Structure 1
């Protein structure tokens, strides 16, 4: 909690950050459609795959925010989906990976975004929200405290970012507006504000400008601890060819990695990327973590 060299430890990078820092102010790497790593079917993967490695690999690479999309099944369980595609991964499977990681690295915390991706199965007993809260959320690893959550209250726990309607259990970040395919601003709570850049399905040129534009706003608003900045660098279009999330990401990641590197900002916000790996040159996630040196 003193050396900047400690941010270079991908599994324990949150250790140096002061306990009093709200998670909002922290620059955190995230993964888009985190549970698509099992899609190995050639045609399914050219449209649905946004990750090639599992949850643990992702976390061991500094990722601390996970984009979870679920669906209520007959068996009254929540499984992971990408549209109408069952990903061969379950919500329990994710929560268990998160627990092991937090057991080994108690200094860390993981933010889980939960969204209803597909319509509930016909024979379901309860609704998506009630099912998730009665069977999962009730688990102790879930932080039940709200407001502008500090890193201290989050260590060893899973912080929930609600992207589902109809919640009845307090805890984490409340659900807000979130319009389709665009960048917007709203409020989470009385003591918080949100700016999200979620322009999936858009031109590469418009996409890159969007990311950078949102990243400039957070750079110049670095000391505003009451403002949440979520920046999705992922881009999806017509697959089958080099228009896949992998193709765009092979350019977008190093590009934004450099952008962050050159500017040397004190805050870049929460950056949710596709294909977290070690292939691309400057490494986006690593640069994002480094921008936290100002907090050390």
Structure 2
């Protein structure tokens, strides 16, 4: 477990990385609106979908960060949504997929971002936060320690990245200030600061520039292990009249993947993208994983 060649095994690429390395330092691929794969097929006539394949496909391709959007039902469960629409995927469904993947590849960790996507259904016993933490988070698969989480402690576990308020249970990355459609910097834990580029609805040119600017900042601070960088390459300029996410991703994915490959960086951050598949070249998630050669 000490060969850069091991990074080529997309199901176990975190294996060769030293356990003392903070997850924040690792360049990690992620999927934006991860659970939208069941309604993505154009025949479904549903807009806003961002993935063609399921969670296991995403994980087997190298993704370790998942952007989960949930809604509390009146049955005390959390289901996945995209705005007001139910995605026909549940939170338990995602967790089970992550569990199996971790069982098959115990060298890896799964980072789960959880955000309240839609108002709770009327008649729900508790709140979104209380229901999640009490019925889901309590599961031992979820790492309950915090700080600048190290890969060593995360292996075989799901590390929560809170994007919901009202948390009362310790574990993962605390919820932090997340302004809308901006590139911002704030604090996360006592020993972790973060910079996020999440301009999800700006024009194409400003988006590519923003992705590159944030990657530049990431590289210029490559060995600052206490600074977290999250870079969303996903874009949806417009409302719904135009299901533009795929169009933009078809250009952005290859462009950014190529930019990374050409710069041969030592760190690119946590790159969250739309449409993980094998259609474009180079493959963004693969180039992101390869940027970890410096850590081997």
Name the TM tier (shorter chain): over 0.9
Q: Give the whole-Å Cα distance in 1 for the aligned partners of 2:45 and 2:11.
A: 28
Q: CA 1:240–1:163 in 2, change beyond 3 Å: closer, same or farther?
A: closer
Q: CA deviation at 1:240?
A: 6.7
What is the DSSP-based 3-state SS (H/G/I as helix, E as strand, rest coil) of the residue aligned with 1:67? strand
Provide Cα deviations, 1:161-183, integer angstroms capped at 9, x if missing partner: 00000000000000010000100
Q: CA 1:46–1:280 in 2, change beyond 3 Å: closer, same or farther?
A: farther
What is the DSSP-based 3-state SS (H/G/I as helix, E as strand, rest coil) of the residue aligned with 1:48? coil
Partner in structure 1 of residue 84 of structure 2: 84
Provide Cα deviations, 1:236-265, integer angstroms capped at 9, x if missing partner: 133777751111000000100011011111
Q: CA 1:186–1:40 in 2, change beyond 3 Å: closer, same or farther?
A: closer
Provide Cα deviations, 1:140-162, integer angstroms capped at 9, x if missing partner: 10000000000000000000000
Partner in structure 2 of residue 207 of structure 1: 207
Q: CA deviation at 1:2?
A: 1.3
Conserved? CA contact 2:40–2:46, under 8 Å: no
Q: CA 1:287–1:41 in 2, change beyond 3 Å: closer, same or farther?
A: closer
Q: CA deviation at 1:42?
A: 3.5
Q: CA 1:171–1:103 in 2, change beyond 3 Å: closer, same or farther?
A: same
Q: CA 1:254–1:183 in 2, change beyond 3 Å: closer, same or farther?
A: same
Q: Give the whole-Å Cα distance in 2 for the aligned partners of 1:66 and 1:258.
A: 23
Alignment of 1:1-296 (within 5 A): 1-40=1-40, 42=42, 47-238=47-238, 244-296=244-296
What is the DSSP-based 3-state SS (H/G/I as helix, E as strand, rest coil) of the residue aligned with 1:37? helix
Which deviates more from structure 2 when the two are superposed, residues 17-26 or residues 40-49? Answer: 40-49
Q: TM-score, normalised by structure 1?
A: 0.98
Q: Give the whole-Å Cα distance in 1 for the aligned partners of 2:228 and 2:102.
A: 24
Gaps of 5+ in 2: none
Q: CA 1:74–1:82 in 2, change beyond 3 Å: closer, same or farther?
A: same
Q: CA deviation at 1:45?
A: 5.5
Structure 1 moving runs of 4+ over 6 Å: 239-242
The two structures, once aligned, show a CA RMSD in angstroms of: 1.3
Q: TM-score, normalised by structure 2?
A: 0.98
Q: CA 1:237–1:217 in 2, change beyond 3 Å: closer, same or farther?
A: same
Gaps of 5+ in 1: none
Q: What is the count of residue pairs matched by the alignment?
A: 296
Q: Give the whole-Å Cα distance in 1 for the aligned partners of 2:193 and 2:4.
A: 29
